[PDB]
Design a protein around this ligand. Structure first.
Ligand SMILES: [C]C([C])([C])[C]([N]C(=O)O[C]1[C][C][C][C]1)C(=O)N1[C][C](OC2=C3[C]=[C][C]=[C]C3=[C][C]=N2)[C][C]1C(=O)[N][C]1[C][C]O[B]12O[C][C]([O])[C]O2
Ligand SMILES: [Mg+2]
Ligand SMILES: [Mg+2]
Ligand SMILES: [Zn+2]
Ligand SMILES: [Zn+2]
Lengths: 21, 180, 153, 16
């Protein structure tokens, strides 16, 4: 049986930001 | 609050398989919720108080791949449908909720935040129903109170004709009980 | 490829915000007028213009994504400003709310068109105008999201 | 004149 693998993440602690150029 | 969420994919199909067999994962870990996969299922794991929790019906007794090879579960509770591993290095933990609030917010694998009205210890109804296939792969993810503290972990959907009207979850309290 | 729900927008004399909800880029009539919005293929005309409501809408531009409307009926709101600050607001009536911590008016300046969010991050309204007492914004006037939903119909 | 887009705000804080 294989290990469980992290394939991605969800981030809750980000706050509104101006998108950089 | 406001609760907002984004998703990032860190691995593709092939790398997941290889990492699954080797159990060795050198990738950097960030965030409170991990998107997780086995050979047959993808779902969520939420970090609460230094432990990374998820559903038994997805993880079984499996190890988690880590930078030092596979890591064994710290907690297993088949009845509660619950499993835990030490939180990965770099992850960030949520805190259990102590406001006893009845307005909950479910975070899905798509990084949406959907409102939930609490109707019991481990049950809540959706304010706007959803295709079951929308919620699929979201088990293990957090239900949050208005302050962004953890109230429970999504376990099962109350569904009818393929439409989920309510959700069944593991209350944080039960985690404390499973630790003991 | 990161998308924004909120646009920072300018006319020759003003600067303010727009918010995308349900595929439409919405802002205040008192800022945009009947103006088209720029695009790499030239001007795009308004799809909706509702002067009573102080409300204007264009199709959502490139580089954007839509907010979902609030369905939780909460009264704890959060206003987002052109500087990306978040300001907590208690909802009073249909279209009014008051700041938990009043701020100088310049702090809210240029944010009309921005969203009011519920605890879920869903859209409750569009910030219409600061309610002021002697250079100090203590409350907010906003366009409830229901009005956007009916304008579309 | 047109309304012109001068910048963008992502509500979740998602970086590039
Ligand atoms: C398939 C379904 C009909 C939609 C079923 N509904 C159901 O059971 O509801 C009951 C009525 C309220 C309480 C339970 C259900 O949501 N089940 C069924 C399984 O449920 C359980 C459990 C459910 C409750 C208590 C213990 C459990 C132990 C093992 N498995 C997994 C769970 C499930 O399929 N979960 C999906 C929900 C989102 O994620 B999920 O989908 C993809 C899966 O890999 C991970 O889980
Ligand atoms: Mg966030
Ligand atoms: Mg999101
Ligand atoms: Zn709480
Ligand atoms: Zn809401």
């Amino acid at each position: 049986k294989g290990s469980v693998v992290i394939v991605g993440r969800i981030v809750l602690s980000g706050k509104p930001a101006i998108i950089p150029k | 609050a406001p609760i907002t969420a984004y998703a990032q994919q860190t691995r593709g199909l092939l790398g997941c398989i290889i990492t699954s067999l080797t159990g060795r994962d050198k990738n950097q870990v960030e965030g409170e919720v991990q998107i997780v996969s086995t050979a047959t299922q993808t779902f969520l794991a939420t970090c609460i108080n230094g432990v990374c929790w998820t559903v038994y019906h997805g993880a079984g007794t499996r190890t988690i791949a880590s930078p030092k090879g596979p890591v064994i579960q710290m907690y297993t509770n088949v009845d509660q449908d619950l499993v835990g591993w030490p939180a990965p290095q770099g992850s960030r933990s949520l805190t259990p909720c102590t406001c006893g609030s009845s307005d909950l917010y479910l975070v899905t694998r798509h990084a949406d935040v959907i409102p939930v009205r609490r109707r019991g210890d481990s049950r809540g109804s959706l304010l706007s129903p959803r295709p079951i296939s929308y919620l699929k792969g979201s088990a293990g993810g957090p239900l949050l109170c208005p302050a962004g503290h953890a109230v429970g972990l999504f376990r099962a959907a109350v569904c009818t004709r393929g439409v989920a009207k309510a959700v069944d979850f593991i209350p944080v309290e039960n985690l404390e009980t499973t630790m003991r």
